[PDB]
Each structure stands twice: as C-alpha cells, then as structure tokens.
Amino acid sequence: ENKVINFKKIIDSRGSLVAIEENKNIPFSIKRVYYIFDTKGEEPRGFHANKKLEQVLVCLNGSCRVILDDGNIIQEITLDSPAVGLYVGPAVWHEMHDFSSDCVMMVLASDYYDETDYIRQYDNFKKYIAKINL
Amino acid sequence: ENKVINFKKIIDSRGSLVAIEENKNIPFSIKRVYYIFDTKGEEPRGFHANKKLEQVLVCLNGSCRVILDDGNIIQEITLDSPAVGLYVGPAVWHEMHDFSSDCVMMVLASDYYDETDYIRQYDNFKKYIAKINLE
Ligand SMILES: Cc1cn([C@H]2C[C@H](O)[C@@H](COP(=O)(O)OP(=O)(O)O)O2)c(=O)[nH]c1=O
Ligand SMILES: Cc1cn([C@H]2C[C@H](O)[C@@H](COP(=O)(O)OP(=O)(O)O)O2)c(=O)[nH]c1=O
C-alpha cells in the first residue's frame, strides 16, 4: 500500500505552484498546519503514531527521509520534492531523518495538536494495531 | 498591526517549529494550502484582489517582497521569516516581488481555488472599492 501523493504542479516562467485542498486532493479536512525549519543536529524525529489524527507530510525544501509503518509494512521514502505528499493515516508510525540543512518540512493535519493522541512506544503501537486487528 | 502575524515559534536542539491552527492563530478556516517554489525570473506575481477570499502569506524559505493595498493605503512588507504571516483580506490588492532564488512561499486560504473571485484590473478594483464605500 502506497502512501505517496503526487500533486498537480503548475509551471511557468515564474516558477512552480502546488495547490492542496482539504477533502479534495486530500482525504481530510484541514485544521492545522505546521512546519519544521532551521534544523540542526543529527537526531531524527517523529517516532509516534496517532489514533485519530490524519496527516500529509511535505518537504518544501531540501529533503528528508521518511519511514512509515502502518503495522503491515514499513515504508521508507525520501522526500525532496514539494510536489510529493506523504499520507500518514491514523494508526501509522512515522519517522523523519536525514533532514537536509536547508530542509523545510511541512505538515497538514486534520486536527488540532493533541498530545493525548500520540503513541510514543513503537511496541505499544505494534500492540494497538493488533487489537485493531480484531 | 492587524495585517502582520506573529506566530509562536518553538526552538530546540533539533530546530524550529511553527504551528498554525485554523481559527486559532488565523482568523479563518483553512480550506486550501498552496505554495510557490523553484522560482526564477524578474516578473512579479500577484496583482489582483479577491472579493471573498481570506489569505495568509508565509515565506517558509528565503524572501519575498509583498505589496498591499486596500484601495485606501498602501503597505509593503518583506516576508523572510517562517514565523511571520501576513493577513490578506477580501478586497485587498496584492503583489509579490523579489522572490529569492530559494524562496518558498506558502499561502493558507479560506476556500478553494476559484478563478471568479479575482479582480485582475486595478481600476475596477479601485472602482470595486468605491462602489463599496458608498455602501
Ligand atoms: C506538531 C506540533 C508541535 N507543537 C509543539 C509540541 C512541542 O512543544 C514541540 C515539538 O514537539 P514534537 O516534535 O511534536 O515532539 P517532541 O516532544 O518529541 O519534541 O512543538 C505544537 O504545539 N503543536 C503542533 O501541532
Ligand atoms: C493559487 C492557485 C492557482 N492555480 C492555477 C490557476 C492558473 O492557471 C495558475 C496561475 O495562478 P495565478 O497566479 O493566480 O494567475 P496567473 O497565471 O494568471 O498569473 O495557477 C490553481 O489551480 N489553484 C490555486 O490554488
């Protein structure tokens, strides 16, 4: 199961543009937009999962390597094009690594920041899935 | 003052984080998120106004020099910080200039793209506004 989303990209003498509409070219309604920039150090991030939240992750500059695990398959994806979106469904584990220095990462979430929706134990994630599986 | 937006930025060992939340640190509901990149050239962008659309421009990388006009007064602000947003309301003429080479410009909008919400002629815009004032 592929999670990548290629967005229609407009081009011209001016540059590029990519438009992202809730419930249109994305499975959900947008309620939060966030982004990580001016990164340093060599520690990855993420390593969590969400029970309700739905997201789409995009690398708008530079690139970063993403690992997705839906409890079925672990997928690794290097993002380095603002035209490629990565769908991170509920009950899916994710991690960011290899954040280039000029990297800008953006995330579109379907819901406000909720610390309580966050699974922080890979192992617990793995379990939560099982149950889900029955 | 009512146009410029200061987003709470989070800085740590790892980097910086900024989260925008519909109707939280922005006056409207996000229906679409668009962005410009891989720019090049010396021909600007924008030069129109929208009738109902509410927007917010954010320079995620490099810089951009923007112009605003609500018919009334003219304003200019150079967006170069991911933490700064710029509110662009209905009936506001606008222009984007000087995109740095490494510029990423993002825009959060109230609704989906709609070719018909635009005013691509300044005079009509001016008119548009006049017509409004009377009201
Ligand atoms: C993603 C996100 C983060 N934040 C805050 C949460 C933290 O205080 C900070 C970064 O945390 P985050 O990278 O999500 O997790 P961690 O605890 O491992 O650092 O940014 C928000 O306030 N809202 C959001 O939507
Ligand atoms: C902003 C935006 C533009 N577009 C497309 C429509 C146009 O063919 C193209 C150009 O955007 P625009 O700058 O608005 O106009 P113009 O090309 O006349 O200067 O972008 C979308 O499809 N969706 C969007 O959300």
Please provide a brief summary of the model.
The first copy, chain A, has one helix at residues 122-132; strands at 4-6, 9-12, 15-21, 32-37, 45-50, 55-61, 64-69, 74-79, 84-88, 93-97, 104-109, 118-119.
Q: How is this structure best described in words?
A:
The structure is a homodimer. The first copy, chain A, is mostly beta strands. The first copy, chain A, has one domain (1-134): Sandwich (Jelly Rolls). The first copy, chain A, is 8% helix and 47% strand. Chain A contains one helix and twelve strands, in the order ββββββββββββα. Chain A has one helix at residues 122-132; strands at residues 4-6, 9-12, 15-21, 32-37, 45-50, 55-61, 64-69, 74-79, 84-88, 93-97, 104-109, 118-119. Chain A has a five-stranded antiparallel beta sheet, with no helix packed on it. In chain A, β7 (64-69) and β8 (74-79) form a beta hairpin. The longest helix of chain A has 11 residues, at 122-132. The first copy, chain A, is globular. The two termini of chain A are 20 Å apart. Chain A binds chain B through residues 13-22, 24, 30-41, 43, 45, 60-61, 82, 99, 102, 104, 106, 108, 112-113, and chain B through 11, 13-22, 24, 30-41, 43, 45, 60-61, 82, 99, 102, 104, 106, 108, 112-113. β3 (15-21) of chain A pairs antiparallel with β4 (32-37) of chain B. The complex binds thymidine-5'-diphosphate (2 copies). One thymidine-5'-diphosphate sits between chains B (32, 34, 45, 113) and A (10, 17, 19). Chain A: Pfam families: FdtA. Chain A: It is an enzyme of class 5 (isomerase). Chain A: InterPro entries: QdtA_cupin_dom, RmlC-like_jellyroll, RmlC_Cupin_sf. Chain A: Homodimer. Chain A: It comes from Aneurinibacillus thermoaerophilus.
